[PDB]
Amino acid sequence: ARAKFERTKPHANIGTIGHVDHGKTTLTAAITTVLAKAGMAKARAYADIDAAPEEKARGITINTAHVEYETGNRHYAHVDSPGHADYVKNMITGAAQMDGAILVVSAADGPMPQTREHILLAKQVGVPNIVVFLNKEDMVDDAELLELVELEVRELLSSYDFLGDDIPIVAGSALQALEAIQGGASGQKGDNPWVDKILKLMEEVDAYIPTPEREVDRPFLMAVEDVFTITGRGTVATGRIERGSVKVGETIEIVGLRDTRSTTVTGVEMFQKTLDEGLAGDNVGLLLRGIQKTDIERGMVLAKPGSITPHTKFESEVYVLKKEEGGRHTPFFPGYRPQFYVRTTDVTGAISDFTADDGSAAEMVIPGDRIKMTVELINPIAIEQGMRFAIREGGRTIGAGVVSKILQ
Ligand SMILES: Nc1nc2c(ncn2[C@@H]2O[C@H](COP(=O)(O)OP(=O)(O)O)[C@@H](O)[C@H]2O)c(=O)[nH]1
Numbered sequence: 284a285r286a287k288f289e290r291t292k293p294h295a296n297i298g299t300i301g302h303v304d305h306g307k308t309t310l311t312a313a314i315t316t317v318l319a320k321a322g323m324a325k326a327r328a329y330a331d332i333d334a335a336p337e338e339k340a341r342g343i344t345i346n347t348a349h350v351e352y353e354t355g356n357r358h359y360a361h362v363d364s365p366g367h368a369d370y371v372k373n374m375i376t377g378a379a380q381m382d383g384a385i386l387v388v389s390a391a392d393g394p395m396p397q398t399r400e401h402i403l404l405a406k407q408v409g410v411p412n413i414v415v416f417l418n419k420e421d422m423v424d425d426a427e428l429l430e431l432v433e434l435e436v437r438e439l440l441s442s443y444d445f446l447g448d449d450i451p452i453v454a455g456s457a458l459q460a461l462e463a464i465q466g467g468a469s470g471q472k473g474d475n476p477w478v479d480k481i482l483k484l485m486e487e488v489d490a491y492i493p494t495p496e497r498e499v500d501r502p503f504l505m506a507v508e509d510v511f512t513i514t515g516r517g518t519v520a521t522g523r524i525e526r527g528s529v530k531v532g533e534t535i536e537i538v539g540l541r542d543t544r545s546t547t548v549t550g551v552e553m554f555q556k557t558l559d560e561g562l563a564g565d566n567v568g569l570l571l572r573g574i575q576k577t578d579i580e581r582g583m584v585l586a587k588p589g590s591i592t593p594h595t596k597f598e599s600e601v602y603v604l605k606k607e608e609g610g611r612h613t614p615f616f617p618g619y620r621p622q623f624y625v626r627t628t629d630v631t632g633a634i635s636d637f638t639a640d641d642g643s644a645a646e647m648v649i650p651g652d653r654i655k656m657t658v659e660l661i662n663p664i665a666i667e668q669g670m671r672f673a674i675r676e677g678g679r680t681i682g683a684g685v686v687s688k689i690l691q
């Protein structure tokens with residue numbers, strides 16, 4: 284009968300990716316500017332977005348512009364960054380979630396090394412989907428040429444396991460659309476062909492990039508931060524619920540550092556609140572029946588049973604911090620054994636099997652660069668694909684990783 288009324292339009296986090304100078308920032312400006320004609324955005328000017336501010340977080344410095352807008356279908360947080368290094372750092376550290384990405388490819392240049400590398404990183408950090416905007420169409424007078432670039436991009440996407448045959452590719456000119464608005468174009472479809480292509484891009488983004496599942500609908504996960512003995516019935520484990528929800532009476536697992544163990548949550552507490560249910564984002568104390576404080580310790584996570592498992596070895600994309608950004612001047616090398624900060628604690632590990640983007644072996648990865656490598660931890664800990672971690676030496680972050688593949 285009646286659909287449920289949605290009080291808020293769906294939300295998704297996207298970003299523009301692609302090679303420097305291909306039009307990422309111009310496209311971002313053009314989107315906000317076209318959508319501002321509908322009343323759905325603050326029109327943001329190129330020079331504004333192009334001057335992206337620095338952000339600090341957990342020891343990583345990244346230049347990143349954040350714009351917001353909506354379509355008729357969905358609200359968007361949109362990230363855009365000046366340089367390649369910002370994209371590596373944002374994608375690896377996860378400082379900007381991407382539910383999907385707009386890959387901007389210059390028609391006049393075709394895909395370029397950072398085109399490949401941003402698709403690579405998109406695959407490795409688990410970006411679900413990509414929409415391509417083939418920019419600078421105004422510079423290519425030749426439909427046969429546009430097709431060849433589009434085929435090359437599809438082939439490139441397919442080689443990183445995106446569905447190259449399904450990815451929408453919209454060809455256009457971000458610059459011409461912005462000039463068309465400045466010259467008086469309305470933002471209504473059919474009013475201006477360059478603006479129509481921006482509107483076409485966003486329709487494709489609305490249709491093709493999925494809205495992420497709500498965090499509270501995902502399987503429960505909480506990293507244990509503190510634990511307390513208050514009565515004999517069990518220990519109160521505290522933390523912030525990273526995702527999902529937990530209810531009194533539910534069976535959860537304690538995962539990592541010790542054999543996985545099942546227990547019943549018999550209470551959920553927040554400040555001044557006894558709850559029946561803790562929700563993602565809530566800082567809670569959870570009473571864990573029959574668990575003694577000695578059985579439980581930071582590093583461990585609480586999780587819906589079977590939703591996450593302990594592992595010791597995995598492939599990852601790792602960024603090495605420059606000394607400028609608080610790292611060391613020396614490269615990472617095979618068999619280096621730093622600390623791996625996994626959610627709450629340092630775990631000792633050894634890195635190995637450095638794999639260059641072309642798949643050849645690498646002898647090292649210098650600060651400021653990124654590489655695929657294998658981590659083996661000394662103790663098992665709850666690991667899943669897309670989990671981020673810091674690599675740390677004497678408490679200082681010297682790199683950043685994202686799990687790309689569980690090996691054991
Ligand atoms: N001819 C043309 N130039 C464009 C177009 N989009 C961007 N540019 C120009 O290309 C340069 C790089 O664009 P920018 O958005 O800064 O690229 P980014 O580094 O990928 O963000 C700028 O001087 C833009 O004005 C386009 O559609 N056509």
Ligand SMILES: [Mg+2]
Nearest residue numbers: 307308364365
């Ligand atoms: Mg830019």
